[PDB]
Amino acid sequence: KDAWEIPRESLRLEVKLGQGCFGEVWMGTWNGTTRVAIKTLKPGTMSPEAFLQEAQVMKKLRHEKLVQLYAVVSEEPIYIVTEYMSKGSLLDFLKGETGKYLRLPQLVDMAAQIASGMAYVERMNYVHRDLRAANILVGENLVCKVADFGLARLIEFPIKWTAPEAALYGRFTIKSDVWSFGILLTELTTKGRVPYPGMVNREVLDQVERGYRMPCPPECPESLHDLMCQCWRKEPEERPTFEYLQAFLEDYFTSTEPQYQ
Ligand SMILES: CCn1cnc2c(Nc3ccc(P(=O)(O)CP(=O)(O)O)cc3)nc([C@H]3CC[C@H](N)CC3)nc21
């Protein structure tokens, strides 16, 4: 086994939070004292190894802005026990009645937190590869944590969120994640709308190659859109670092938009 293994009896699945095709997510209790989240595996869907590699990545990462792994049960049905995030998906949140009231300051702040989680990823020499709102979890007090580390890997695919060079040539770097982050900014500034409204995957790929970039979302300051465009520079190395993005977003209302309403 490994040091992250826990007896299945020390878990108590309670509310089914969600369900996918790989299995489902449950809010439960661990050791009778701890509130947790449990990701289960549907026995046929994917190999134990394939499902658990997400947990393999999480054993090497630990940051306040990344969903924390608590333990695993590696005998079918396989379980991945993580910290529980009380508000669920950022996407559902941005879409819901809940998020219809979020204003730019809260939005920029959520971005700053995600950028901080990614800045850790960046300095740990990893690439997430699946960065988008659906993969960010919201908690109490609008705390945003990065989740879904299954595709993440040590730097040894939806064209809408994936950088061109990563989607076309498999060139996955922290800079391709920076591209995804710029797309994630549009999701935050539009209430979770799907990027490139009215364009099919093929049209997106084609258009992005010709230099097309999404225009400034309504109500989004031009300065925040410029940051998005920096995240989408065609040359991966011209794209800002997550360390830069985190600082820029945290200071946004003083250093970039002091006159803000
Ligand atoms: C396993 C990591 N993790 C840790 N916490 C998680 C969580 N929490 C969660 C999701 C939804 C609600 P909710 O429906 O009651 C919210 P509300 O609308 O009443 O405010 C509450 C907690 N949801 C999901 C997953 C679960 C499946 C989903 N497609 C993606 C996130 N994954 C979570």
Side-chain angles (χ1 to χ4, degrees), residues 1-260:
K1 273 178 280 190
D2 122 83
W4 290 89
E5 265 292 320
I6 60 163
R8 189 188 312 263
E9 320 85 58
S10 60
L11 285 164
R12 173 179 161 213
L13 316 209
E14 305 170 13
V15 180
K16 198 164 84 75
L17 302 168
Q19 164 228 352
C21 50
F22 304 121
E24 35 191 32
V25 193
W26 282 74
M27 175 276 274
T29 295
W30 179 26
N31 290 139
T33 57
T34 317
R35 166 73 120 277
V36 287
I38 304 94
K39 281 182 61 162
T40 64
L41 171 57
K42 187 77 180 301
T45 317
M46 65 193 299
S47 66
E49 186 151 64
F51 182 70
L52 281 175
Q53 65 182 41
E54 164 176 41
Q56 232 50 75
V57 181
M58 303 186 308
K59 292 168 176 180
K60 310 272 211 177
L61 308 179
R62 174 71 200 105
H63 189 257
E64 52 163 359
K65 301 313 186 178
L66 305 198
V67 177
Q68 187 188 354
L69 166 67
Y70 284 173
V72 307
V73 173
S74 53
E75 184 175 20
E76 302 151 278
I78 295 163
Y79 291 174
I80 292 181
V81 190
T82 73
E83 67 173 299
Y84 176 68
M85 302 297 294
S86 58
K87 313 285 188 171
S89 166
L90 176 61
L91 212 225
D92 295 341
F93 199 79
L94 288 167
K95 300 202 79 185
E97 44 168 53
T98 33
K100 69 186 294 292
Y101 297 110
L102 300 162
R103 291 160 186 277
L104 197 64
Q106 290 87 57
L107 296 169
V108 168
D109 175 78
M110 294 179 270
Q113 299 182 51
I114 297 162
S116 169
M118 287 312 284
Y120 169 84
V121 162
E122 179 168 80
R123 66 185 173 263
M124 285 297 285
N125 271 291
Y126 273 79
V127 54
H128 191 276
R129 312 165 76 206
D130 208 359
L131 184 68
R132 51 152 91 212
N135 288 156
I136 300 303
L137 286 173
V138 185
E140 285 303 305
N141 197 205
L142 299 188
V143 170
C144 298
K145 256 81 132 59
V146 185
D148 302 278
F149 288 95
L151 296 178
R153 64 166 183 216
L154 207 42
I155 311 182
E156 299 142 87
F157 290 109
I159 191 57
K160 283 165 184 170
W161 279 270
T162 308
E165 81 282 355
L168 288 165
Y169 319 119
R171 287 178 168 162
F172 287 98
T173 57
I174 195 74
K175 295 294 175 175
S176 51
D177 278 351
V178 162
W179 175 296
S180 302
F181 186 79
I183 297 299
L184 164 29
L185 294 182
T186 69
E187 294 185 276
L188 278 166
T189 61
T190 65
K191 286 156 281 178
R193 287 299 235 130
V194 169
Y196 309 92
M199 296 193 163
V200 200
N201 279 15
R202 204 74 212 170
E203 230 218 319
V204 164
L205 177 58
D206 200 78
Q207 280 292 269
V208 159
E209 278 296 306
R210 300 167 179 261
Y212 171 81
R213 293 297 185 272
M214 289 190 266
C216 186
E219 277 261 287
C220 173
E222 284 178 27
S223 61
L224 186 53
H225 177 237
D226 293 345
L227 192 75
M228 286 167 197
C229 296
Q230 277 163 217
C231 292
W232 305 324
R233 293 219 249 263
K234 85 184 297 297
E235 296 309 316
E237 286 302 323
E238 295 180 89
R239 270 115 77 161
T241 53
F242 279 117
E243 180 190 78
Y244 173 87
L245 292 162
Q246 182 187 158
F248 173 95
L249 290 163
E250 286 171 343
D251 295 355
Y252 195 72
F253 294 104
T254 305
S255 308
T256 317
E257 292 301 332
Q259 328 283 47
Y260 192 71

